[PDB]
């Protein structure tokens, strides 16, 4: 349940199906108590039945919809597993590495197989933590937090 822009909130589509299930269930109980004409109990037990399908897997008997805006299948639980919109393809399309970088390549003729030229500027970010600490081993920075601010801007690096 997130705060997006101004007042726009944003929630996982599962919450609409969950309200579905919850309301029906409760109205069921209330309708059993209040007295129960048979058709109305069935009609509800039916609705409740379908709802219980929706948070598991939408589209197996028909498809649920957010109100007029998007005729969109509310991501049912297996959808989140199987990745029915291509979420599986994304999952094995990759997660994102924490210490990674990218840049254009250029032939380095005298470089030996053994080595490769990587931009200092890129090396700084990639090996920042290792660098921070090393700064403290030396007189350059008293501590990490210090070392960090020391590097927060370009013009500042001794």
């Amino acid at each position: 349940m997130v705060q997006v822009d101004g007042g726009r909130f944003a929630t996982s589509d599962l919450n609409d199906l969950y309200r579905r299930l919850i309301n029906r269930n409760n109205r069921l109980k209330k309708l059993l108590a209040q007295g129960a004409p048979e058709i109305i109990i069935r009609n509800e037990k039916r609705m409740l039945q379908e709802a219980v399908d929706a948070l598991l897997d939408n589209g197996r008997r028909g498809a649920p919809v957010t109100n007029p805006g998007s005729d969109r299948p509310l991501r049912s639980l297996t959808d989140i597993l199987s990745g029915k919109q291509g979420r599986f393809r994304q999952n094995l399309l990759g997660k994102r590495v924490d210490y990674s970088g990218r840049s254009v390549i250029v032939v380095g003729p005298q470089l030996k197989l053994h080595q490769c030229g990587l931009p200092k500027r890129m090396a700084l970010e990639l090996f920042k933590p290792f660098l921070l600490k090393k700064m403290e081993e030396k007189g350059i920075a008293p501590n990490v937090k210090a070392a960090r601010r020391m590097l927060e801007r370009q013009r500042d690096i001794k």
Partner: peptide, 12 residues
């Protein structure tokens, strides 16, 4: 089989 009609047929 698609719900609305069954109920409608049921209590109607």
């Amino acid at each position: 089989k698609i719900s609305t009609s069954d109920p409608v047929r049921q209590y109607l």
